[PDB]
Amino acid sequence: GFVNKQFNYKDPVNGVDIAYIKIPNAGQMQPVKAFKIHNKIWVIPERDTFTNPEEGDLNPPPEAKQVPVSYYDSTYLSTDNEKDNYLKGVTKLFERIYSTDLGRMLLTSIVRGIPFWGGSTIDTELKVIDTNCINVIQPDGSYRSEELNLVIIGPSADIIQFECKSFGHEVLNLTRNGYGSTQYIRFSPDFTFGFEEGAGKFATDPAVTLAHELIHAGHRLYGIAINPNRVFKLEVSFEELRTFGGHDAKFIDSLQENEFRLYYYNKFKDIASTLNKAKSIVGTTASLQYMKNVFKEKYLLSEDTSGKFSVDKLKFDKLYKMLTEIYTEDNFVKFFKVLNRKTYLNFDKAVFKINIVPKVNYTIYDGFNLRNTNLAANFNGQNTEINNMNFTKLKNFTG
Ligand SMILES: CO[C@H](C[C@H](CCN(C)CCCc1ccc(F)c(C)c1)C(=O)NO)c1ccc(F)cc1
Numbered sequence: 001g002f003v004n005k006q007f008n009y010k011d012p013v014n015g016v017d018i019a020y021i022k023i024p025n026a027g028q029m030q031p032v033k034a035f036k037i038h039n040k041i042w043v044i045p046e047r048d049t050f051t052n053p054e055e056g057d058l059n060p061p062p063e064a065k066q067v068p069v070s071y072y073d074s075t076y077l078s079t080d081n082e083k084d085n086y087l088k089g090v091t092k093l094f095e096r097i098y099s100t101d102l103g104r105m106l107l108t109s110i111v112r113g114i115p116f117w118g119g120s121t122i123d124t125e126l127k128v129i130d131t132n133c134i135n136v137i138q139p140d141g142s143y144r145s146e147e148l149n150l151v152i153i154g155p156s157a158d159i160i161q162f163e164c165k166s167f168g169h170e171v172l173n174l175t176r177n178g179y180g181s182t183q184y185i186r187f188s189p190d191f192t193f194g195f196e197e198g199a200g201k202f203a204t205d206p207a208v209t210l211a212h213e214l215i216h217a218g219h220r221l222y223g224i225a226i227n228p229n230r231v232f233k234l235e236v237s238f239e240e241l242r243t244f245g246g247h248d249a250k251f252i253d254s255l256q257e258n259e260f261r262l263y264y265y266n267k268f269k270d271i272a273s274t275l276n277k278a279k280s281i282v283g284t285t286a287s288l289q290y291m292k293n294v295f296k297e298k299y300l301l302s303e304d305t306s307g308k309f310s311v312d313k314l315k316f317d318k319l320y321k322m323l324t325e326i327y328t329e330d331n332f333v334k335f336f337k338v339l340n341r342k343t344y345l346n347f348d349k350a351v352f353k354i355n356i357v358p359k360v361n362y363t364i365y366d367g368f369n370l371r372n373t374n375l376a377a378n379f380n381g382q383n384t385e386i387n388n389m390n391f392t393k394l395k396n397f398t399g
């Protein structure tokens, strides 16, 4: 079990794993109910009008997006019952990922991926960066700051626009300097998009889509995301190609991979020297020794008998390759043994309402492709024309 409590949206607040929280969006917001599903991971069953307060309007834009498929519904995820169904869906998707060895590994890497304590103006002092925390409300209406790695939140305006995003910093490029930052994944388990394989019409397994986003989060928590302005020539970012994997990832050549490899060895070495020169820490509950050990475990640092850290090249290479070549969408497709589109780019627009919460629809083990039934054959379970009761087709947005 990756998620040990089976939360109901109604369940009473306890200020520990069910609480009203505020995120550090740099805006005034009212508290939202949130759920801690595992150490360092929370879920917020709300439409995301928060990570960017400049994105409150859940209505469609005058200029329709052209690729990929898009869909708008301002009322989705507004009622307690959808929030409850949302929460059970996301939990179920976590258990499906965790039931795989690749998933278990990915999720463990995410939990260790504590964002680095680079908040101090003093180069000898460790200090948390506030945008890597949330504020949890207490009985007396005060707030306590809690550190976290990951938040799953409902989509913004485009219901099927999933993405992994995070709060930035004034000088630091936290997702690219090796530090990392808390990641916010806009995601819905209540909808999916189709692909073709006339041609057969299939639905993407949303455990695959979630895994896709978790892979982004993995990169960004370890501060090794590829700048989005680095693109493979249409136009697709290296970061997407890397995340998707399969034949797509081999388009990032051998030479650019080596630069990134060297670049990040150098980052990890810098973080090791910041830790070695650390003489003080801000905060009441964690010792400098304790945080030094947290980052030793994260970056897989070597510790000598005198307490000093260094990077082992062998363990670096393995970690790096793990996060970038092993954790890929293509690799999850293999482990899940489901059908998935063959490339990142997908021009065959189709969106569906689904409901993976009932076991008669979708299980942790087989997804839609229920074993020992007609849906285990030929990915029938994902065939939107065979398993049509599980995929209610929606009008994709055209403007
Ligand atoms: C799981 O969500 C992805 C798109 C979304 C990026 C959205 N933007 C911010 C990035 C790039 C957009 C894009 C997506 C596909 C595509 F073919 C082209 C030319 C461009 C994303 O990649 N989040 O991590 C998806 C891919 C194929 C699909 F059919 C449906 C969804």
Ligand SMILES: [Zn+2]
Pocket (backbone or CB within 6 Å): 212, 216, 240, 243
């Ligand atoms: Zn992506």
